[PDB]
Ligand binder design. Sequence first.
Ligand SMILES: [Zn+2]
Length: 225
Amino acid sequence: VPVYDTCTVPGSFALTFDDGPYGFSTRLDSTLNAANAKGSFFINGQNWGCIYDYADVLLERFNNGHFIASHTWSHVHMNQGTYEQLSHQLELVEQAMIRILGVKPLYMRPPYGEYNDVVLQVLRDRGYKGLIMWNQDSGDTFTPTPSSAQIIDSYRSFPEKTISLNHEIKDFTVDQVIPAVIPILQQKGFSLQTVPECLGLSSDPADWYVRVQEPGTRDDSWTCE
Ligand SMILES: [Zn+2]
């Protein structure tokens, strides 16, 4: 399983978001969609909300050509887990995407950027095609936290082919940073692409997932409890 941290397509730029969806996601996606920009989303199952409660956002996101990938179920320190626990951690997210969207993800990003040989082996055994890291950090979860103005200014110097880490769970990222930096990056000639496209893999969204079955309808199984 390859590890990726930088784009390869010239002029490309990957805005990525961890820990979502969240109560600001419809706003974020509206902002991206209005600019024809595509985001990359590494979602949790049960961390800042139960993924099943975000089904409507996930569906809009999925059908609008944004990249959705796994961030584990419980946002675990993956280096402290056994093969079996990590497989369960991935499986539970797969199951939620199968029920809501009809598909399994083919990519993932480890929480805290922590991974080891056992993680890569589980990814390989479970059919994943890549582990996606990053090469620039917005800082939006640093503590103390940079101001929006400071984060926006850092984005003015991120070079082409950046894979940028952001977090959907920070209100100022959705409401201040991303509305300001989309024009900065697009106006200077960068193409705001998903991670798979920016890596020269496919730009067709269907290639980022495994079709499993038709999406389900909400029933009593759509729960993190
Ligand atoms: Zn995270």
